[PDB]
C-alpha cells in the first residue's frame, strides 16, 4: 500500500499555509530546490499564493528530493509541522484515502495532467474562491476564446484537496461537445444517470414522444440527486454547445460551465451566477508561464527558449511546441505551423455558421491587414450580397459566436483574432482588385481644399496604402500621397507620447 510523500503532501495545506512562510526559510540544499526556484517563490505577494507555489514546485520532482524535504524541515527550528506529515505511514486518515484515491481516477483522464500543464495562479485562485462558496443552486461560468485552456483550469482546481473535501468526493464529468436536438441530449443525459446509481429500469414508458421521455428521466433524476447523501455534488459541463441544452440539466445543484459562445455567457446573469473570464488580460499566461509550458515539450535549457514572444493561448501554443519536438519548423522556421491540426481544430470550429449566408463572409474578411480596427461603415462595401442594415445584423449574428467578429462597439468591427484569421489563404477568387480597389472609394473625392479634410477616423491614416497594394502603382504614386504633404502629416497628428520627448508610453 505504502503511500509516498508526494502523494500525500498535497493534502494538508491550511496548517502548512498559515503558520509557515517560505521566505522565512531559505536553507536551500541545492539538489532539492534550484536557486531560481526559491528566487521565484518569495516574489509572490501572499501566503495563499506563497505557500501554494511551493507544492506545485515540489510535486514536479522525483520522490527522493521530497523524501529528503520532509526530513529537512526537522533541522529547521520547527518540526511541529512535520510530525503530522509523518502520519503518512500506516495512518492515512480514513477520509484521506477517499481523496488520494479519487484524484487518480481523475488523472485517469490520462494525457491531461499526465505530462502537460503548468498550473496557473490567477485564474486558479479566483476560481477556488468562488467554487468553494456556491450553495446548491448556482453556477460558475468559465468563458474563453478558442483554446485558451478552460477545460484544464476547470480540472486543476477540481483536483485540489480543500475543494474535493467540500463536495464529498462526488464529481461527475460530462461533455456536451456533441449536443443538439432532443435525441442527443437524451443520450448524454442518460449516461449521467448510470454513474449515479447502477440501477435504472426503463419503467417510464418507451412512448415515441422524445420530448416527453426525457422530461420523465429529468424528473427521476431531480429527486434522486438532491434527495440523499449525494446532497453536495457538482456536475461539470465541458463545452456547453446549446443554449438550451443547459436547460437539460437545470435540476441539479452546484453545476459548472465552460463555454466558447457569447450567447451563453450572456444568457446567464450575475444575479444567480458568477463569471470567470479568461480573456481579461490579468488572467492570462504571464510571459513567465509560457517559459514553463513551452519548456516541457522541448526538454531543453532556458537558453533554448523562444525569443520574440509568440502568443498567449495554450492552444496553438502546444501545436508549435509539439511541431518542434517532432516535425518541421526548426522552431526558427514556422510560417506553416502544422496547418492541419491548427486547421482541423479551427475548421470545424467554424462549422456552426450558415455557409452561403455567412461562411462566404469570413472569406471577405481576409481583405484586412491584421490586428487593426475596421470601420463598420466601411464594412458595408465588401459583401453587398445581402444589403442595407444587415451589416449590423450580420456582425451581431456573427458576434454572438465567440469573438468571431470581436466587437469594439465604436463605429467599427475588430479582427476576430489571429486564429480565425490565421487559418488560410484568402482565395475568394475575383474579389481582390475590385474589393481592394473599390474600397478605395472614399478619398479621391476629396483632393485639395482649405483647412482640415473630412478624412476617415484612425483607420485610413494607417492601412489605406495597403489597399493601394492591389491598385495601379503610378495611380498610387499620384495619390499615394508621398506627394501630398496635406493629408500625410495628419497621421502622426493623433500620435503622441505618454512620456518625455519621444514616442509611445502611449503611441509611436
Ligand X SMILES: Nc1ncnc2c1ncn2[C@H]1C[C@H](O)[C@@H](COP(=O)(O)OP(=O)(O)OP(=O)(O)O)O1
Pick 77 or 351: Cβ nearer ligand X:
351
The verdict on 315 binding ligand X (CB under 6 A) reads yes
256 binds ligand X (CB under 6 A): no
3-state DSSP: the chain helix, strand, coil percent, rounded to 5? 50, 5, 50
- For residues 168 and 347, which CB has a smaller minimum distance to ligand X in the complex? 347
The residues, ordered by sequence, that sit 6+ positions from 307 with a Cβ below 8 Å of its Cβ are none
Q: Give the nearest distance from C-beta 459 to a second copy in angstroms.
A: 37
Collapsed DSSP state (helix, strand, coil) of residue 400 = coil
Beta bridge partners of 277: 143
* 318 is a site residue for ligand X (CB under 6 A): yes
Phi, psi torsion values for 203, nearest 5 degrees: -45, -40
Q: Is 104 in the site for a second copy (CB under 8 A)?
A: yes
Is the Cβ–Cβ distance between 466 and 369 less than 8 Å?
Answer: yes
What is the pattern of x (binds a second copy, CB under 8 A) and - over residues 146-175?
Answer: ------------------------------
Distance CA 84, CA 431 (A): 72
Three-state SS letters, 208-219? CCHHHHHHHHHH
- Please select the residue that binds ligand X; options are 233, 314, 367, 413, rule is CB under 6 A: 314
Q: Is 146 in the site for ligand X (CB under 6 A)?
A: yes
Instruction: For cell 515539450, name the residue.
Output: 297
Out of another protein, ligand X, a second copy, none, what residue 315 binds, judged by CB under 5 to 8 A for its kind, is ligand X
**Is there binding between residue 77 and another protein (CB under 8 A)?**
no
Is residue 498 close enough to count as binding another protein by CB under 8 A? yes
**Spatial distance between the Cα atoms of 378 and 439, rounded to a whole number of angstroms:** 8
181 binding partner (options a second copy, ligand X, another protein, none; Cβ < 5 to 8 Å by kind): none
Provide the mask over 286-325, with x wherever binding to another protein is found by CB under 8 A and - wherever it is not.
Answer: -x---------------------x----------------
3-state secondary structure of 389: coil
240 within 8 A of 248, measured Cβ to Cβ: no
Grid coordinates representing 406 are: 470581436
CA pair distance 410, 395, nearest whole angstrom: 13
With binding defined as CB under 6 A, does residue 295 bind ligand X?
A: no
The listed partner (a second copy, ligand X, another protein, none) that binds 113, CB under 5 to 8 Å by sort, is a second copy
Span of 102-110, 157-165, 293-301, 496-504 interacting with another protein by CB under 8 A:
496-504
Distance CA 465, CA 288 (A): 37
Binding site for another protein (CB under 8 A): 43, 287, 309, 498-500, 502-505, 508
Binding site for ligand X (CB under 6 A): 116-118, 120, 146-147, 149-152, 239, 293, 314-315, 318
Amino acid at each position: 500500500h505504502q503511500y509516498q510523500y508526494k502523494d500525500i503532501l498535497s493534502v494538508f495545506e491550511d496548517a502548512f499555509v498559515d503558520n509557515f512562510d517560505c521566505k522565512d526559510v531559505q536553507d536551500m540544499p541545492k539538489s532539492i530546490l534550484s536557486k531560481e526556484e526559491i528566487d521565484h517563490i518569495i516574489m509572490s505577494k501572499d501566503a495563499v499564493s506563497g505557500t501554494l507555489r511551493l507544492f506545485w514546485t515540489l510535486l514536479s520532482k522525483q520522490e527522493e528530493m521530497v523524501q529528503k524535504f520532509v526530513e529537512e524541515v526537522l533541522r529547521i527550528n520547527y518540526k511541529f509541522l512535520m510530525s503530522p506529515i509523518k502520519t503518512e505511514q500506516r495512518q492515512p486518515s480514513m477520509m484521506t484515502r477517499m481523496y488520494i484515491e479519487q484524484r487518480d481516477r481523475l488523472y485517469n483522464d490520462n494525457q491531461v495532467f499526465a505530462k502537460y500543464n503548468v498550473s496557473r495562479l490567477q485564474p486558479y485562485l479566483k476560481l477556488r474562491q468562488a467554487l468553494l462558496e456556491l450553495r446548491p443552486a448556482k453556477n460558475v461560468l468559465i468563458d474563453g476564446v478558442l483554446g485558451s485552456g478552460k477545460t484544464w483550469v476547470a480540472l486543476d482546481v477540481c483536483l485540489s484537496y480543500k475543494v474535493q473535501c467540500k463536495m464529498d468526493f462526488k464529481i461527475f464529468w460530462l461533455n456536451l461537445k456533441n449536443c443538439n436536438s432532443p435525441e442527443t441530449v437524451l443520450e448524454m443525459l442518460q449516461k449521467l444517470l448510470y454513474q449515479i446509481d447502477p440501477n435504472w429500469t426503463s419503467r417510464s414508458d418507451h412512448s415515441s414522444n422524445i420530448k416527453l421521455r426525457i422530461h420523465s428521466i429529468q424528473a427521476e433524476l431531480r429527486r434522486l440527486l438532491k434527495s440523499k447523501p449525494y446532497e453536495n455534488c457538482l456536475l461539470v459541463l465541458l463545452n456547453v454547445q446549446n443554449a438550451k441544452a443547459w436547460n437539460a440539466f437545470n435540476l441539479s445543484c452546484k453545476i459548472l460551465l465552460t463555454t466558447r459562445f457569447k450567447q451563453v455567457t450572456d444568457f446567464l446573469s450575475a444575479a444567480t451566477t458568477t463569471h470567470i473570464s479568461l480573456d481579461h488580460h490579468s488572467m492570462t499566461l504571464t510571459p513567465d508561464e509560457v517559459k514553463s509550458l513551452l519548456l516541457k515539450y522541448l526538454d531543453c535549457r532556458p537558453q533554448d527558449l523562444p525569443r520574440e514572444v509568440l502568443t498567449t493561448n495554450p492552444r496553438r501554443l502546444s501545436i508549435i511546441a509539439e511541431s518542434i519536438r517532432d516535425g518541421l519548423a526548426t522552431w526558427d522556421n514556422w510560417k506553416h505551423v502544422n496547418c492541419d491540426k491548427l486547421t482541423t481544430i479551427i475548421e470545424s470550429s467554424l462549422n456552426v455558421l450558415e455557409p452561403a449566408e455567412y461562411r462566404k463572409m469570413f472569406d471577405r474578411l481576409s481583405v484586412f491587414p491584421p490586428s487593426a480596427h475596421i470601420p463598420t461603415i466601411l464594412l458595408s462595401l465588401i459583401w453587398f450580397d445581402v444589403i442595407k442594415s444587415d451589416v449590423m445584423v450580420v456582425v451581431n449574428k456573427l458576434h454572438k459566436y465567440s469573438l468571431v467578429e470581436k466587437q469594439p462597439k465604436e463605429s467599427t468591427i475588430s479582427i476576430p483574432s489571429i486564429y480565425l484569421e490565421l487559418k488560410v489563404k484568402l482565395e475568394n477568387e475575383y474579389a481582390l482588385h475590385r474589393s481592394i480597389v473599390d474600397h478605395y472609394n472614399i478619398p479621391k473625392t476629396f483632393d485639395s481644399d482649405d483647412l482640415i479634410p473630412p478624412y476617415l477616423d484612425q483607420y485610413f491614416y494607417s492601412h489605406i496604402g495597403h489597399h493601394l497594394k492591389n491598385i495601379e502603382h503610378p495611380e498610387r504614386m499620384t495619390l499615394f500621397r508621398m506627394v501630398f504633404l496635406d493629408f500625410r502629416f495628419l497621421e502622426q497628428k493623433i500620435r503622441h507620447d505618454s512620456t518625455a520627448w519621444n514616442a509611445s508610453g502611449s503611441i509611436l
